[PDB]
């Protein structure tokens, strides 16, 4: 199946305090592997997965220097952006940056990303061609002109299509027992009587990896979406995921309904029906 | 592995 590597950076100004907060995390697929937090005592990039600990001191030193370069860049950006939006020196503001790459089942480059947000909305993003920019508003055109002039896209492209994907492959290999595993969902259905007139059927998928999954309801083999609820896929805390989907049905009509479960660990999708 | 080149906005 497909895989991704992504880095997420959050930069929060703290006026009155105290230097801005800077948090960086890296992910391979749905598995976090490194962190850095400005407020932590180490001031180092830290391992957050067992397989990354195999990397020697050159790596940790290198990543620490680079994440501090990112921190410092973001330190300057908070001021620059406050200037672009004619904002006061006394209000907290949030900058986020995300970049990374996707590979297909043959582990070849599929797509690259590099986007930037300010105060909860898009600021500037690299387009899928990895050659042009989308600026979200008037202020971001300044940055767009700036980055076009400096060939920032070409620089990002070289990393995204090259270094990004090669390290992703390395991680996938080194942490294969974790990252290349498929844990098929453990499934079951529960039944709860709302009253004499209705019952809720809830279809569960537990202890699965990777997070990608689809849960759907049918009634008489027709897709059923009305009176249905689907929660966000959620972390179990042990490296696996959980999800459920529910439908409210008329009393006596439970057997019409089926839950359908699709997941990489399932050769064929599962079909579940209430078993009283 | 992180990008080493980061341009200011």
């Amino acid at each position, epitope marked *: 199946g497909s895989h991704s590597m992504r880095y997420f950076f959050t930069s929060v100004s703290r006026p009155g305090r105290g230097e801005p907060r800077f948090i960086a995390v890296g992910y391979v697929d749905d598995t976090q592997f490194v962190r850095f937090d400005s407020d932590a005592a180490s001031q180092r990039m830290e391992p957050r997965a067992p397989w990354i600990e195999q990397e020697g001191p050159e790596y940790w030193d290198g990543e620490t220097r680079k994440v501090k370069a990112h921190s*410092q860049t973001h330190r300057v950006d908070l001021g620059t952006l406050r200037g672009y939006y004619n904002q006061s020196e006394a209000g907290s503001h949030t900058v986020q940056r995300m970049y990374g790459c996707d590979v297909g089942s043959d582990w070849r480059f599929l797509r690259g990303y590099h986007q930037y947000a300010y105060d909860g909305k898009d600021y500037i993003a690299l387009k899928e061609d990895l050659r042009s920019w989308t600026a979200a508003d008037m202020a971001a055109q300044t940055t767009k002109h700036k980055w076009e002039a400096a060939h920032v896209a070409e620089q990002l492209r070289a990393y995204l299509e090259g270094t990004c994907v090669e390290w992703l492959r390395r991680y996938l290999e080194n942490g294969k027992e974790t990252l290349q595993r498929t844990d098929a969902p453990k499934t079951h259905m529960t039944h709860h009587a709302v009253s004499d007139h209705e019952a809720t059927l809830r279809c569960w998928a537990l202890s699965f990896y990777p997070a990608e999954i689809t849960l759907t309801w049918q009634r008489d083999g027709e897709d059923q979406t009305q009176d249905t609820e689907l929660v966000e896929t959620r972390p179990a805390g042990d490296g696996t995921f959980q999800k459920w989907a529910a439908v409210v049905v008329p009393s006596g009509q439970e057997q019409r309904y089926t839950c359908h479960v699709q997941h990489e660990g399932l050769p064929k999708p599962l079909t579940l029906r209430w078993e009283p | 592995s992180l990008l080493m080149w980061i341009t200011q906005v």
Partner: antibody
Amino acid sequence: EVQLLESGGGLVQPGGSLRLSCAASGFTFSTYQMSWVRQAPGKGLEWVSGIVSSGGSTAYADSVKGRFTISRDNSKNTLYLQMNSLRAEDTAVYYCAGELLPYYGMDVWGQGTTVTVSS
Amino acid sequence: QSELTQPRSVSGSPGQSVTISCTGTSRDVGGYNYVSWYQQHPGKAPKLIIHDVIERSSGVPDRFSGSKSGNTASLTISGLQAEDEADYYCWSFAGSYYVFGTGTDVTVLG
């Protein structure tokens, strides 16, 4: 024991191209971020381009963007600079140089190869 | 251009000190703590002597010291000796590239 040895420098007409090579020996070349730095006769040092240890990710001075391409191959312990659209102002001694860690400053250097851009 | 500005020349008699300034902007010198200094003797490749603003490379005595304040880094050479005569260049990370200063010739008088 540690050595970087450049070659490929020579005379080329304005608008022309040249490829430089740098053969590394006596250190683990594959772990160093590599750069090209040039120095015009009687003039100061100018960083030209750099490439990460694994190859792929690169960076260039404004003065050479779109014209130069840096590359390496770790199996041959060699660094390359392909230079296109050459200008009289590209005339210089070109050094190959490396750093183990990012942002440290290059501490292993070659001896330079001379490029002359002239009609 | 983006250059890192240094003085053309500084000098001192043996035993004295010189200081060499290196000024950039928040894009570089003022933005990061990744300033280095190089010594280059005639007909030789540059040698790294200082990295990470203040850290001396192997073999470099404490009489060479680096610092910075705001947008300006400094190299001070105390206890000046004849063999200190050379060109000195500062250097900085600048986000999307590296950049050297314009270089300073150090003369040892007498």
